[PDB]
């Protein structure tokens, strides 16, 4: 019981500065299923964040895909904060456009 979530933060399409895109926060391998997943822009909650319906894998672990429309700039920072019972503090993964 209580498996720690594995988080990836990535764009749908290869990121060009100024071109519209979708930022993905792919959260997996977590239990129990109660989880909060905020997508931040410069450490600030993004309002229009759509979550997929929750599923689980052969091993009982849950997975989910939070995403949001974004237009990547030179300066603007994007992250994904994940509060879950299995971790003392929330977990933040910062977007890396080369990954």
């Amino acid at each position: 019981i209580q498996k720690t979530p594995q988080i990836q933060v990535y764009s749908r399409h290869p990121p060009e500065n100024g071109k519209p895109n979708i930022l993905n926060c792919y959260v997996t391998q977590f239990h129990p299923p109660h989880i909060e997943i905020q997508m931040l822009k410069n450490g600030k909650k993004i309002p229009k964040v759509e979550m997929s319906d929750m599923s689980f894998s052969k091993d009982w672990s849950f997975y989910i895909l939070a995403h949001t429309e974004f237009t990547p700039t030179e300066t603007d920072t994007y992250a994904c904060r994940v509060k879950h019972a299995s971790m003392a503090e929330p977990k933040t993964v910062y977007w890396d456009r080369d990954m």
Binding site: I1, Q2, K3, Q6, Q8, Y10, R12, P14, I22, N24, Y26, T28, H31, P32, P33, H34, D53, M54, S55, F56, K58, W60, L65, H67, D98, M99
Partner: protein
């Protein structure tokens, strides 16, 4: 390969905050095609594949009824189990179930199963023979003895051998067109200069379906995975998938390092150099 009809069921208690959240998700060959979600204006079994819109209102109404009944049954199980494990009513807990059959190309049952899990731990499971049970702990033995001397092995076997199999065949005929869909990966290599002599070649793979893929890095036709770095195959979110592998290589030797992409969509594996 072996085709499968699997049903993934979750009941999550929310003490104080309404009734437990219940949800079934159906899968045909590991692709979601139906889903029932207790939390919704009007909870109904809904098609998740476009090809499941062939089925009429008789299908959906009956499946919804099944779900509503299961929801109420699992709502008890959650309470029942609090007793078996001398747990507190305030605490939130999770019952999960994987029901399903899998059949060969011949249409014949290869294997059937019913797996329960309480709070992530294995609880009780229907054996290969579809006759006996396997209780993971002492609490599970109470419901083994109960389901044995209630004839649940007979009732499940009738579904798994009979209903599950007959319906899988139907779902495969209907969804074949879209289930056989494969998009072959579009793949490039990105150069990333490091502080020292070393540089990082990253092999990209985009727009491929299904997720099942393999990325390798070769030097003298010899695969190096120990000094390689690769991320779990992730969804693009438009129905396609992404995955990259990256190796750190001596500067000026970028042409001796080759990336190879393995996908069922490709007529043969795909070879890549830094261009």
């Amino acid at each position: 390969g072996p085709h499968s009809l699997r049903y993934f069921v979750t009941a999550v208690s929310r003490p104080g905050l309404g009734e437990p959240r219940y949800m079934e998700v159906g899968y045909v060959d590991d692709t979601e095609f139906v889903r029932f979600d207790s939390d919704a204006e009007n909870p109904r079994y809904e098609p998740r594949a476009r090809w499941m819109e062939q089925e009429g209102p008789e299908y959906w109404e009956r499946e919804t009824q099944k779900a509503k009944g299961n929801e109420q049954s699992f709502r008890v199980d959650l309470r029942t189990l609090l007793g078996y494990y001398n747990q507190s009513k305030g605490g939130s807990h999770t019952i999960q179930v994987i029901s399903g059959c899998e059949v060969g190309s011949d249409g014949r049952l290869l294997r059937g199963y019913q797996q329960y899990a309480y709070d992530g731990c294995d609880y009780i499971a229907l054996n290969e023979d579809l006759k006996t049970w396997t209780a993971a702990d002492m609490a599970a033995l109470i419901t083994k003895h109960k389901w044995e001397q209630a004839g649940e092995a007979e009732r499940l076997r009738a579904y798994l051998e009979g209903t599950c199999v007959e319906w899988l065949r139907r779902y495969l005929k209907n969804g074949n067109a879209t289930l056989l869909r494969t998009d072959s990966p579009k793949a490039h290599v990105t150069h990333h200069s490091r502080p020292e002599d070393k540089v990082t070649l990253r092999c990209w793979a985009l727009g491929f379906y299904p997720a099942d893929i393999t990325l390798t890095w070769q030097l003298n036709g010899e695969e190096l995975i120990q000094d390689m770095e690769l991320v779990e195959t992730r969804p693009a979110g438009d129905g396609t998938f992404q995955k990259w592998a990256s190796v750190v290589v001596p500067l000026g030797k970028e042409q001796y390092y080759t990336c190879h992409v393995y996908h069922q969509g490709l007529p043969e594996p795909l070879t890549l150099r830094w261009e």
